[PDB]
Amino acid sequence: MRVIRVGTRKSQLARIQTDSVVATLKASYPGLQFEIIAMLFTKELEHALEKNEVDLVVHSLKDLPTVLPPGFTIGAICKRENPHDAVVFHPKFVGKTLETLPEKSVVGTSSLRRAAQLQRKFPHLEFRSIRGNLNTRLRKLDEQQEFSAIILATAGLQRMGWHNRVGQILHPEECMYAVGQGALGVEVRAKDQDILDLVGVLHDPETLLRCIAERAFLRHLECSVPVAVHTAMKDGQLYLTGGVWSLDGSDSIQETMQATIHVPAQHEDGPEDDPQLVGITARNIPRGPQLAAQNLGISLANLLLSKGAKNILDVARQ
Numbered sequence: 001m002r003v004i005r006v007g008t009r010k011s012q013l014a015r016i017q018t019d020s021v022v023a024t025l026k027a028s029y030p031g032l033q034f035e036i037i038a039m040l041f042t043k044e045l046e047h048a049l050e051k052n053e054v055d056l057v058v059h060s061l062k063d064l065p066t067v068l069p070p071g072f073t074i075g076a077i078c079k080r081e082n083p084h085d086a087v088v089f090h091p092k093f094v095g096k097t098l099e100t101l102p103e104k105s106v107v108g109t110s111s112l113r114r115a116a117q118l119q120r121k122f123p124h125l126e127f128r129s130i131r132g133n134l135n136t137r138l139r140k141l142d143e144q145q146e147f148s149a150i151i152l153a154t155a156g157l158q159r160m161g162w163h164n165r166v167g168q169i170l171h172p173e174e175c176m177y178a179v180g181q182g183a184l185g186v187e188v189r190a191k192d193q194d195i196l197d198l199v200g201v202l203h204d205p206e207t208l209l210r211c212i213a214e215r216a217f218l219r220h221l222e223c224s225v226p227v228a229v230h231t232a233m234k235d236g237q238l239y240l241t242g243g244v245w246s247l248d249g250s251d252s253i254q255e256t257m258q259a260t261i262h263v264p265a266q267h268e269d270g271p272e273d274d275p276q277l278v279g280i281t282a283r284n285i286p287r288g289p290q291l292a293a294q295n296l297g298i299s300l301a302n303l304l305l306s307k308g309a310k311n312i313l314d315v316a317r318q
């Protein structure tokens with residue numbers, strides 16, 4: 001353990017996210033040296049991991065599939081930023097809400113999950129795909145008049161320093177978030193235990209359990225489907241709400257389940273070589289609550305499946 005090599009894409013958001021993690025690692029490990037190597041695109045980064053070119057990579061958790069290639073694992077789930085979706089309005093609709101927009105106002109989003117939920121809740125608005133990164137989308141919004149508004153993650157605006165552009169934050173009842181949204185995942189080599197121990201300091205127990213539940217739900221249903229969730233840990237209880245929608249949002253199934261899961265306060269010297277749970281390795285967090293969280297997500301998926309979720313999903317791909 002001497003120089004820690006952190007790989008990163010050249011994009012601005014990826015670069016910011018990577019920096020926030022490196023900052024947190026330096027703070028914990030002031031005596032070590034960290035170096036940033038700037039290069040699904042996920043498979044080029046993984047290749048650099050595979051080749052020992054870098055030791056770790058930072059991702060937005062929702063961009064990581066519930067099943068990772070053998071030889072890689074999520075070594076860290078960092079404290080969640082705000083998970084909710086948000087609305088940025090055209091320069092003409094300040095103070096306005098989705099509720100208050102004019103009929104047939106056009107809302108830009110390329111997300112099936114967002115479009116399906118928002119068409120259902122706002123049948124008088126028009127939802128249309130929009131392309132580009134966050135910067136490009138904001139320019140199109142202000143520089144033309146195709147869009148009366150766009151939908152983006154609260155968390156991404158926040159990290160870009162554009163929170164003041166947020167006109168509306170959506171509640172679960174209007175729009176539930178994507179699995180893992182607002183959380184960062186650090187990906188490493190599954191068998192590299194030094195690195196795993198090192199990044200293990202980043203795990204936020206609460207976010208870790210929430211994301212295990214959410215990703216177990218997602219995986220058991222079997223980025224590119226109209227599925228959404230909401231999680232909360234409150235008073236020793238983990239709450240999981242999940243939903244599935246048809247492309248137009250007309251068909252819908254949503255349910256909530258709950259389980260007693262303590263949020264673990266203390267770390268522990270845990271079993272090396274226990275299997276990762278939904279791609280995640282957290283040997284320093286108690287196993288029990290992790291299993292309980294995964295079981296909760298499995299439970300909810302089965303309930304939705306018994307209610308027809310599979311045929312909704314077969315019709316709602318991308």
Ligand SMILES: Cc1[nH]c(Cc2[nH]cc(CCC(=O)O)c2CC(=O)O)c(CCC(=O)O)c1CC(=O)O
Nearest residue numbers: 060062110111113152153155156178181182183223
């Ligand atoms: C799986 C995934 N990854 C990203 C793209 C991406 N990946 C991470 C950030 C920010 C939030 C965080 O990092 O979770 C976002 C950008 C957006 O959600 O505002 C999107 C949104 C696509 C857009 O509407 O065209 C989705 C789909 C889901 O959200 O329904």
